[PDB]
Amino acid sequence: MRHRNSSHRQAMFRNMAGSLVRHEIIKTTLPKAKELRRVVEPLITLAKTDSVANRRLAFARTRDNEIVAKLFNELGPRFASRAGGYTRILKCGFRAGDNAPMAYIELVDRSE
Amino acid sequence: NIIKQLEQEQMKQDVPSFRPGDTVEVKVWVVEGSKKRLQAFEGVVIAIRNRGLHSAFTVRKISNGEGVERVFQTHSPVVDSISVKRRGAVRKAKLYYLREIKERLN
Amino acid sequence: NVADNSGARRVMCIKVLGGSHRGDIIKITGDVLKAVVVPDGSVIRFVLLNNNSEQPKFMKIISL
Amino acid sequence: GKKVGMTRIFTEDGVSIPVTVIEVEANRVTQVKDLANDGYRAIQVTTGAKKANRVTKPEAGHFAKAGVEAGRGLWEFRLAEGEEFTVGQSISVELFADVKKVDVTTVQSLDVVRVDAERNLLLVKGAVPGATGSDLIVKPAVKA
RNA sequence: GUCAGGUAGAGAAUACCAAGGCGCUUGAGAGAACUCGGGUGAAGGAACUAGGCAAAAUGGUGCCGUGCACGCUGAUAUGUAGG
RNA sequence: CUGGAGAACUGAGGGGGGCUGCUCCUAGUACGAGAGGACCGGAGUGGACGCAUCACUGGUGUUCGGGUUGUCAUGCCAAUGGC
RNA sequence: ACGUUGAAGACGACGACGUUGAUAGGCCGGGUGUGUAAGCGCAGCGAUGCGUUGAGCUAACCGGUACUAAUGAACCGUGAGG
């Protein structure tokens, strides 16, 4: 008593996680953003240390060569000194379509 | 940390290292009225449960006609000594399929 | 199964004696007669009578 | 006291007893009730500690009146006209040494296995209500 | 009514793909007070019922038992009887 | 003997409850013309119902890990993932 | 109230903590489970096994750390009690 199906849920987070890495920021429902964190940062932590095995495992997740290239190259070093908390969630009102709570989820970067 | 501190002194550090599928002899104390006898049990380990003070292992013995399984508490005072006879070369954590082995030479 | 050598090979339990709505004694079967099924946390995972006395509390059984 | 997990103890003979292990800090009295004021005899006791910023001063003043350090929650037990207590007195777990059966709140008539004061720890044979970290009240068994 | 590719298979079953055709005309979070439907879950496997019904189990064929073989063969032969 | 809050107590009344059987000491005792042989109280050993209920004994666990059949994608083989 | 938690079994005003701040989502260490991964090398130049390596991986939990985010203004409830 708690004290989408599994396949669809896993695929959605895999896709959304890839989009977040590619764009550094995405607009999505607040519950999705909160649950996405438990899938996103673990990728960046693995990318902090580079190895053949880590590269392969990082590919097995998100199943995309572009993301793996994006990781291990700049997301790794840019967060090497940071111990967790690579993500930030900003609430941005409600979606007009169905009044869903929306929030921007964005990596702590882009300080130009 | 309260639980761990309480069990460290209760545990025994003389536990021999054994792996599933090994042939093990275990000595167990026996009480008959007013006498303490040492009983020797021969068998093959088919399962090990590691939980610290609650660690236990299952030993299956092929008796005269049918097998007998016995779950021993590693840290219980009842068990006195454990000796390994053969180094079984299996590659499974739990050997339950023996209900219905090579030798490691390492 | 029968642990002894009385001749019987397979038996069925038809009543669990020892209490209402229940090595305990049981009643088994076309001959119906009583029978007996044969602390540290360990577990041990793996006989006929005469309806009046054991005569295969079980000194004889343990000795045999 | 506070429930802190559960474990077992092996005796010399061989039998193993499953024990509920309860941590019991020193319990310090805060108020004493009498016939003159409250119409009955009881002592109010506290335990643990609470953040100063989180403890509202209506209780802090109540604690400060007795010289007591602010603890978490308050409980009080009735007296049996055979014992006396003074405000601010500190009560530790050795009081359970002479008693073999205790009542944990209610599951009653539980054997006590071990008591020590250096670690403020009490041991009970069996299971007690509530999950880990919950508050428990241990009193001597009434069914003598 | 006709035209219906490749692999696996005895087949026109079923699963997985290319080309082509699509996401079916309300959605985002939270978990079950068990109204409904599957897989799995100790066994004296009938302690239920008029009826072990509906499930489950089951099904096959590198076959000599009225139990055995089964996914791969350095090699026999870097393709054996032969159209 | 009605100012506005945060706690610890006194418990009338009401609801769920007054398990069962056997052995041993008491005791070759009481009753009875003998044998047979107590009852109660105390202690100990099972089963049934209910609360608590996991350190230890089992089962289950659509996310992690090991192994694998048919087919397909990620321009490839190996190494993976999805159905 | 809002936000981070809800093992009290979804009517939720409830246990605590909300920057003198480790409740949850991460980054480490230890234990358990899985029982010999990816890659490299020797022999057989195949199907396996051995060294590399009792190792790699491990969610809700255990032991630590705030360089992320629960921040700083309102609303409600009063001012001496027949």
C42: chain B residues, CB-CB within 8 Å: 28, 70-73, 76, 78
Closest residue of D to B52, CA-based? D7
CB nearest to D7's CB, from B53, B77, B78: B53
Packed helices A30-48 and A6-23: angle between N→C axes, nearest 10 degrees: 70
- Note whether D89 and D78 are within 8 A (CB): no
Asked if residue A67 is part of any domain, the answer here is yes
Neighbours of D67 (CB within 10 A): 10
Closest CA to B76 of D113, C43, D121, D114: C43
Alpha helices in C1-64 (DSSP H): 59-63
- Note whether residue A112 is domain-resident: no
- Rounded distance, CA A39 to CA A83, Å? 16
Helix-, strand-, coil-residue percentages of chain C, each rounded to 5: 10, 25, 65
Nucleotide nearest to D31 (CA to C1'): F8
Residue D25 neighbours by CB under 8 Å, 6+ apart:
D1, D2, D47, D48, D120
What's the total number of domains in chain A?
1
Residue A19 lies in a domain: yes
Contact B71 C46 (CB under 8 A): no
Question: Contact at 8 Å (CB) between D24 and B2?
Answer: no
DSSP at A88? E
Angle at CA of residue A11, ends A10 and A12, nearest 5°: 95
Residue type, C40: D
The Cα-based distances of D84 to A28, D25, D45, D54, D93 in angstroms read 66, 21, 14, 33, 17
Closest among C29, C48, C28 to C38, alpha carbons compared? C48
Residue ranges making up the domain that contains A35: 5-107
Q: Is residue A42 part of a domain?
A: yes
- Token readout for A82 is 């940071």
Task: Please report whether residue A49 resides in a domain.
Answer: yes
Q: Which helix (H) or strand (E) holds A93?
A: strand A87-94
Q: Which of D7, D8, D9, D16 to mutate to test the interface with C (most CBs of C within 10 A)?
A: D16
> Would you list the DSSP string of A66-79?
HHHHHTTTTHHHHT
CB contact under 8 A, C39 and D14: yes
Neighbours of A105 (CB within 10 A): 21
Q: Report the distance separating Cα A84 and Cα B54, nearest Å.
A: 35
Which CATH number belongs to the domain containing residue A68 in this structure?
3.90.1030.10
Distances (CA, A) of B12 to B37, B59, C36, C43, D62: 21, 20, 39, 21, 50
Residue A85 lies in a domain: yes
Distance CA B1, CA A111 (A): 44
A26 domain-assigned: yes
Alpha helices in D6-109 (DSSP H): 57-65
Nearest Cβ partner of B66 from C42, C43, C46? Answer: C46
Instruction: Confirm whether A53 is domain-assigned.
Output: yes
CA distances from A80 to A45, A107, D137 (A): 8, 14, 50
How large is the angle between the packed helices A30-48 and A52-60, nearest 10 degrees? Answer: 160
Query: Resolution limit in angstroms?
Result: 5.3
Say which experimental method was used.
Answer: cryo-EM
DSSP one-letter code for B30:
E
What's at D80, amino acid-wise?
A
Chain B interface includes C59 (CB < 8 A):
no
Which pair of structure tokens corresponds to residue C19?
């209490």
Kindly give, in sequence order, each residue whose CB lies less than 8 Å from that of residue B106, ignoring residues fewer than 6 positions away.
B87
Share in percent of chain A as helix, strand, coil (round to 5) = 50, 20, 30
